[PDB]
Amino acid sequence: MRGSHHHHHHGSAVSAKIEIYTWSTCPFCMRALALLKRKGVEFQEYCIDGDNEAREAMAARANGKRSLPQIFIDDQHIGGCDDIYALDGAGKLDRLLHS
């Protein structure tokens, strides 16, 4: 396989699992999406507009919270828009993303 390949016992390649539950038109969700997009990271958005079943699935993972958005990185609950911005302002978010 021609190319410039990195080796460090990675095995099968996998990357940060980044998830965000949103309503598309929530201004807090929009602000959080903008931050993740500006980082350039690959991520999954669960847009749950009008979907109560999905909100209950979200609350089950997010400490019972139904507020939006809810963000997870590598299966760890990070919190909402304020939480991710606070992490970035503290110089801690890139390391979680990771780098």
Q: Is there a domain that residue 58 lies in?
A: yes
Q: CATH no. for residue 73?
A: 3.40.30.10
Cβ pair 96, 78 in contact under 8 A: yes
Query: Tokens in use for 47?
Result: 């847009």
3-class DSSP state of 76: strand
9 phi/psi in degrees, rounded to 5: 55, 35
For residue 53, give its domain range.
11-99
Q: Is there a domain that residue 1 lies in?
A: no
Q: Is there a domain that residue 71 lies in?
A: yes
Per the structure, the count of domains in the chain is: 1
- Contacts of residue 39, defined as CB under 8 A and 6 or more positions apart, other chains included, come to 93, 94, 97
Q: Is there a domain that residue 53 lies in?
A: yes
